[PDB]
Amino acid sequence: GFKQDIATLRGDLRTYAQDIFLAFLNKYPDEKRNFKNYVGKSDQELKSMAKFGDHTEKVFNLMMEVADRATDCVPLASDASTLVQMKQHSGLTTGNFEKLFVALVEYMRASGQSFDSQSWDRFGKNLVSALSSAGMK
Ligand code: HEM
Structure with a gap:
């Protein structure tokens, strides 16, 4: 389930982080409006830009802590x-x-692996609710 999934992602976190974040940016190309430096780049390019590697690892390190807590x-x-x-x-x-979480669940759903994609879907909805309650627009 969800807690095992956090252990699975953490065991290859840099690969999973890059691959989910790319899934996100390719599903929602207008989202590169927050990341202007990422325009006109293939995935393999993006993987070779330091601020892509270092945002994406830091995104997933913290997301896994939030999931774990x-x-x-x-x-x-x-x-x-x-x-x-x-x-x-x-x-x-x-x-x-x-x-981000729609792309993350779709990625889990398409993977060969027994991720608890329904728990990630609820996690993403619950986090968005919590962000709103904490003051995000
Ligand atoms: C759970 C979700 C997320 C986490 C944990 C997260 C975490 C972080 C962290 C830790 C940083 C500091 C990393 C650094 O610059 O050294 C950062 C920066 C940033 N985040 Fe996020 N982030 C998340 C979601 C998002 C989303 C969904 C977007 C846009 C769609 C976004 C856009 C940015 C931008 C634009 C920056 C600074 C510029 C850059 O990425 O190069 N983040 N984030």
Whole structure:
């Protein structure tokens, strides 16, 4: 289930992080409007740009901690507060986070592997709710 999935992702986190984030950016190309440096780049290119590698590993390191601190796929309100308050996320709305989690669940659904994709779908919805409650637009 969900807690085992966190252990599976953590065991190859840099590969999973890059591959899910690319799934996100390829499913929702207008989302590169938050990442202008990523325009006109193939996946293999993006993987070779330092700020892509280093945002994406830091995104997934923190997302796995937030997932690990959750109860029944419901994140801590403190985790949502921390995420909202991040100066680098001033541009963003809950829509940006919803799209990341849609791509993450679709990635799990298409993988060869017994991920609990329904728990990730609830985690993504619950995080978006928590972000709204913490002050995200
Ligand atoms: C659980 C979800 C997310 C986490 C945990 C997260 C985490 C982070 C972290 C830790 C940083 C600091 C990394 C660094 O610059 O050294 C950062 C920066 C940033 N995040 Fe996020 N982020 C998340 C979702 C998003 C989403 C969905 C977007 C846009 C759709 C986004 C856009 C950005 C941008 C634009 C920056 C700074 C510029 C850059 O990425 O190069 N983040 N994020």
